[PDB]
């Protein structure tokens with residue numbers, strides 16, 4: 001197994017996947033690494049199993065259809081993984097914890113949002129459809145773009161949103177377009 005966490009790339013107290021060589025800190029994995037379970041399979045392995053059980057699940061989908069799906073266990077897992085993929089980028093640090101807004105010439109967003117809040121919301125089963133999760137994720141980056149205006153720091157929101165969107169299209173097998 002790897003000797004660094006797959007998400008944050010640091011050593012420490014790591015839990016090892018039994019079906020692939022990845023390792024995780026307890027709260028870097030999403031959901032948090034389960035207390036018992038021997039063997040244990042990580043979220044990458046669990047997602048791969050879904051695809052293998054239903055190969056047709058990789059055929060192209062319309063985003064509008066994906067968004068209306070109810071958060072049954074498999075869609076719950078896919079949103080967990082998609083959230084994890086964003087945390088995997090080091091630039092996610094900027095969006096992880098609760099922000100505050102005091103910048104000359106800007107006003108804070110009406111509805112602040114951050115990754116740890118989405119994490120908690122997923123954990124607490126607060127989203128009933130995939131749309132709920134996706135809206136909060138996109139809101140993170142849209143709030144950032146709006147607040148930081150022409151400051152070059154706005155690019156961080158663009159960059160992390162692109163990681164989100166690419167992973168969204170992969171995980172939920174959105175039909176490829178030009």
Ligand SMILES: [Zn+2]
Pocket residue numbers: 005006007008009010024025028
């Ligand atoms: Zn970690």
Ligand SMILES: [Zn+2]
Pocket residue numbers: 017018019020021022041042043044045046
């Ligand atoms: Zn694994």
Ligand SMILES: [Zn+2]
Pocket residue numbers: 053054055056
């Ligand atoms: Zn099938």
